[PDB]
Structure formats: C-alpha cells, structure tokens
Design a protein around this ligand. Sequence first.
Ligand SMILES: [Mg+2]
Ligand SMILES: [Mg+2]
Ligand SMILES: [Mg+2]
Ligand SMILES: [Mg+2]
Ligand SMILES: [Mg+2]
Ligand SMILES: [Mg+2]
Ligand SMILES: [Mg+2]
Ligand SMILES: [Mg+2]
Ligand SMILES: [Mg+2]
Ligand SMILES: [Mg+2]
Ligand SMILES: [Mg+2]
Ligand SMILES: [Mg+2]
Ligand SMILES: [Mg+2]
Ligand SMILES: [Mg+2]
Ligand SMILES: [Mg+2]
Ligand SMILES: [Mg+2]
Ligand SMILES: [Mg+2]
Ligand SMILES: [Zn+2]
Lengths: 69, 55
Amino acid sequence: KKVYTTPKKIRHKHKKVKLAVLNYYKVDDEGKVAKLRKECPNCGPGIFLANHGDRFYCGKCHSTFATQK
Amino acid sequence: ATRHVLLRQGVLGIKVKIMKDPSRNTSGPKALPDAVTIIEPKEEEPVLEPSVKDY
RNA sequence: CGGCACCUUACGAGAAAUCAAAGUCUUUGGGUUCUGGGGGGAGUAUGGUCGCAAGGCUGAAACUUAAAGGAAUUGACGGAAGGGCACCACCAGGAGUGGAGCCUGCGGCUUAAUUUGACUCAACACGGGGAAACUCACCAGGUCCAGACACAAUAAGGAUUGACAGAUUGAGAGCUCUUUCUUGAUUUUGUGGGUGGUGGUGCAUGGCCGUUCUUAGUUGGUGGAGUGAUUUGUCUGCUUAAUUGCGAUAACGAACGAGACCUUAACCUACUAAAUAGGGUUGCUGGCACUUGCCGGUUGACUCUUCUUAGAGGGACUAUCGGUUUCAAGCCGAUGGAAGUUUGAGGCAAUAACAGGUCUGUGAUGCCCUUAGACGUUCUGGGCCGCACGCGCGCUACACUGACGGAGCCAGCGAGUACAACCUUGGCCGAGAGGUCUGGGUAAUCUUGUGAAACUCCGUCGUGCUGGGGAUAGAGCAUUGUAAUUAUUGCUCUUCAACGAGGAAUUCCUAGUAAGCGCAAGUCAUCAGCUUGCGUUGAUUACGUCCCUGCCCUUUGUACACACCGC
Ligand SMILES: [Mg+2]
Ligand SMILES: [Mg+2]
Ligand SMILES: [Mg+2]
Ligand SMILES: [Mg+2]
Ligand SMILES: [Mg+2]
Ligand SMILES: [Mg+2]
Ligand SMILES: [Mg+2]
Ligand SMILES: [Mg+2]
Ligand SMILES: [Mg+2]
Ligand SMILES: [Mg+2]
Ligand SMILES: [Mg+2]
Ligand SMILES: [Mg+2]
Ligand SMILES: [Mg+2]
Ligand SMILES: [Mg+2]
Ligand SMILES: [Mg+2]
Ligand SMILES: [Mg+2]
Ligand SMILES: [Mg+2]
Ligand SMILES: [Zn+2]
C-alpha cells in the first residue's frame, strides 16, 4: 500500500466545560424567588434564555431566538 | 446436497449425491430410460387335431 | 558321432530380463584356478618392479557419504517409427483480420491518483468492467463511529448529548477555535473483549468456473500371466462422430463416459380449442364497373379450426430397392417421405487432475495485517478516459454489385409501470432532436403487423481522394440527471483528413450455415461501435488427407518421477 500523509494538526471533540449549580437565578427574601435573565416565550417556563451582546437563543429548540431582552 | 462446515482450522465442503431407486421414485418415470426389460413368453401346444368346441 | 545355432513347460533356476544351462543348491559337499565384500576418495598417494617413452603390472590410507547400483512396473517425455483423429488442423474455396480512420481492451510512458484482478491456446468488448458522482477499491482533502461486551476513573457541586448568529468553513460539515445556552447516566475514561475492512495471501481453503475434453476416455468382479509393482479384459484388422460396433480372442459378463436421455427446431386438411388467434356466409355500410361481380369498413349476427397457439398422440427405424463389404459392422446411390449430415441445434456430460482464475459475487472463509485523526465508514473534487508509441477484440470505408433521392415495402426473438413513474400509440407545436396534451397496456388484447434494415422500382452523379469516405474541427438547438468543460447522448449548419482492397503473418468457416443486413434484450437516470438471442438476404468450395498445427493412442528408448521449465 501507499504511505499515510502526516500533516500533523489533530482536532478532538470538546469535553464541553460542564458546570452545575450555575449562578443564574436568585433569592433575596427566602419565601419568593427572583428569576435572572428570562424564560422562553416559545416553550414553557423552566427553560432559560442565553444572554449575549444583543443576541439570544435557547437549547430545547436547538437555537431559535432573535429579539433582544 | 451441498453444505459448508466451519471449523477452527478452516472450512470443510460437504457434498452428497443420493441416487434413489427407480421403483420408489413415483413422480416422473419408474425406470431408467436405457433399460429394456423383455417379458418371458408363454408356451402353447401346436396341432392336437383340428377339433371344435361349441355352445 | 562333431563345432561357431529355435519352442513350450518348467517340476530345475533365477531379483527379473531370461536360462536346456545361468539346472541336478538351506533336500546346502564331482574335481580345481582365479576374482569380489556399501559407495566415493582411487586404479590415485607411496614404495616396488617393468619399460625408450607413453604407460603397464602391483597397490594404501586419511577423509568422506546414505545411499551407489541392478532388474524391471506404471507414467512423463524423445528434433525415434508406425496407426488414428480435428475447418480451435490443412487441403478446394469463401469471408476475412493484419494496412487506412475511428471505437474500445491491454501494455509502455505519464500522472497527487491516472484502484485493482488476469498474459500461449485456457489474459487482451474479460471481471456481465458501456467508470460523469454513486459504483470505488486510487489520490488530495475533510466528516462519522457503526470502539459489541467486561471491569474501574469522573457518577448530577453533570457523564456526556445538543447548539441558531456571523468570523470559522471548499461549505446554511458546530469540522471548530468566538460563544454561554442546552442534554440528562444513553453515555463516557480506562482495562479484558469484539467488530468492520472492493486490506493481504487462490502456493492456507470452500463453492463456482475454466482447462486438459466434449476429446474418447475410465473402472472394477471373477479367471488366466507374473514372487512383485502390475497386466490381460480395455485388441491384428475393418467400421463409427464415439472403447461406435463387427469380428478376431484367457478371457467371461458388467458399470461409468459416449449413446439412450432431455429441451428445442422441423410434419400433422387426424383429434381436443378459441370475439385475448385466424377465417367463411351474412347485416348495415364506402367506392366501383354499373347485371349477377371486385375491393373494402364495422367484434352487427350465425357458423368453422386450414394457417394460430398448445394440449394429447403419432411420425423415421437409414424405410423400400440396387449394388459394395469375410454377402458382417457398416458404408455408397436411387425411390418414396415433412424430415435420410447422430434428421438439425444445443442441455447435461466420466476417472484423474491443474499449485489455471476467483479470498474485488458472496454475513463462503483460515491465518496475518489493520482496527476510532482507521486499510472501517462516510462526504467533496478529481481519476480510471492522460499520450513519443506497441500489440488484442471491434466498427466505418476505400464506391458504379455504388452513392444519393424518391417510391415500393416484408420479420422474428423479446420486453414493458401503481407506489410508482415502464413501454408509451392517437392529436397539436417543432427542419430537427424533442416537446406537449390525451390515452391503451400488469399485457396472444395496448406499445406492435414493433409496416427493422439490407433489399425491390424509377430518376440524379458517372470510373476525378469525385456527389466515394466520413474523420478531426467550430458554433447553436435539444434531452438525462443534483452536476455534462475532460464534446454523456441526440439533432442543425459548417470542416472536409487518412484510405484506390492493405506486406510478413494469421483468424473463422462445410448449409438456411459463411458473409451481409438490421432488430432484441442485457447493463440502463442518460449513453452501443459491446453481448446474449432473434429473424431477413443468402453464396463460393470440400464432403478428402495426414503435408503443417495440435491432440490421441501403439511399439520403442530414458540416468527423468517437483516428471524437459526435468536431470
Ligand atoms: Mg487517506
Ligand atoms: Mg570400498
Ligand atoms: Mg482449446
Ligand atoms: Mg474502458
Ligand atoms: Mg468478444
Ligand atoms: Mg458513462
Ligand atoms: Mg466487504
Ligand atoms: Mg475480507
Ligand atoms: Mg488455485
Ligand atoms: Mg495461481
Ligand atoms: Mg485379478
Ligand atoms: Mg489396461
Ligand atoms: Mg441393402
Ligand atoms: Mg443432437
Ligand atoms: Mg401482438
Ligand atoms: Mg469530398
Ligand atoms: Mg458494452
Ligand atoms: Zn427554545
């Protein structure tokens, strides 16, 4: 057979940078809750917006926002 | 009847031919096409007078 | 009585060829001389001796080696000899190929890569291999896990799954690095363990195929010949396509192979049958001559089975007659007969094999390799198609037995869609190609009488590289598909090249054949110069022989047996 080419640069699947008990949401009083950012208009509450410099999206609908918030 | 047989060393090819007897074949001919069996003839007595036998 | 000489059985012998001695030998002893003791080293070394010499007589060992020999048996083979057979041999002829251009295979070169298998017949239009991607194996590049299962590291303060936006990216590949949202224990990180591979090896195998060979060969049971391997049967002759038979015969009767068999191709006014096959009378109905008659068109009626199909049967058995041949097997000629070449054509097709091909048909597979940036997969763009040039199938032509126009106008094999997009008549548009509307057909019904060509008739050019010939070319019009440039193919105009029947060589062929001619399916989205079939037109010359070529036997010889590519 013919020899393999060998440029060098390999690309692996990203490990994702997992993070839980994320700093979204808050509570001040104790009794009631204070939501941070916002929930989805398309789907029901529980899902939360992605916040960037005048650009939003959500993951349950893979990524489908446009309007600011 | 052909049938391959897989073993540790490799394959063994088994083939089997069984020539059924013509008499027990039923479907198709009951005998080979070349064989010509002739029946045995039957004896008769010549002459014994002209004679008659009426009713 | 004497020396220079055959046949059978050997009971005498002998390993056997053979031997009337090579006999009277394990039932061992007539009388004597001489010679030999695995092969080589070696008739050498040395010494003697004999010689003019060359050489002779005489004559070692060291060391080496498992065979060296003999005889025959079967093979294989032989530039041994006889006898067969075959248009893959040749004659007598035809058609050719080889030349020309062009297609297409295969080399060689080229190229990132122009993937690979196979090279006398038995590689080279083969891989059903006419590659636009797919196919695909190759290259440049990217993607993906499709890493089964076992066992631990994270075990939700996330394992890992996803992810629009533009840069990113060939690129509306989240391929990612920009991102900060999702996803919930699938996974995933390891370690056992599989899995896939048009990766390798056909000289590790299966199956299938090809080839010895579709040639005529092959076998065993007794019985005989041999100690035996073996042999005879299985053969002098003549026949036959055939180890086909007749005969002759230590052979007799048998089996396989051939034949028989099967399928198809031919005959049936004899049967059974039909508005899905064809006719007859007659109705209505079109035109004619105009008497009653001629051609029609209509599934209107009635009836038929010749052609049709296709069921059941027969029919050819070399039949009758003549010669010819030990008056056998058969062969040769006339007669009849649809058929007298095994009636034609195939289908199958023995024993033993080949290191023939195929591990790129295969969830046929051994072992090796590989095995998560794969040699797995999958996308994207190419490539198999490149060109100083060799050969191999092929097509097109070198015209007047033609070309071109009109006109005449006749086949058979087939094939063909409902979950797809098949064949596609009929009507309109278009010089064409091709578009459109509509049908008919799941099919003796519709395409389709596939009114296919080559042919036949009347006219135009007349033997000039000409209107022969059509290549390369440029442009546009079409179609298939996602994609047509490295013209896919079709059509339209234009360009008009080589080639005046092809040297040495060599292929194919014996009758509905050869050759010509087209159709046909196969592959197929699209492409035929290919292929398996089909029919149409339809000859020339044998109807023999071993000259060549191959193959087969027989007898011969053999230091060969991995078998002449031998030793
Ligand atoms: Mg690579
Ligand atoms: Mg010796
Ligand atoms: Mg041959
Ligand atoms: Mg090709
Ligand atoms: Mg061919
Ligand atoms: Mg093509
Ligand atoms: Mg495979
Ligand atoms: Mg494999
Ligand atoms: Mg082999
Ligand atoms: Mg080989
Ligand atoms: Mg015997
Ligand atoms: Mg014999
Ligand atoms: Mg006679
Ligand atoms: Mg025949
Ligand atoms: Mg028809
Ligand atoms: Mg010209
Ligand atoms: Mg082809
Ligand atoms: Zn959403």
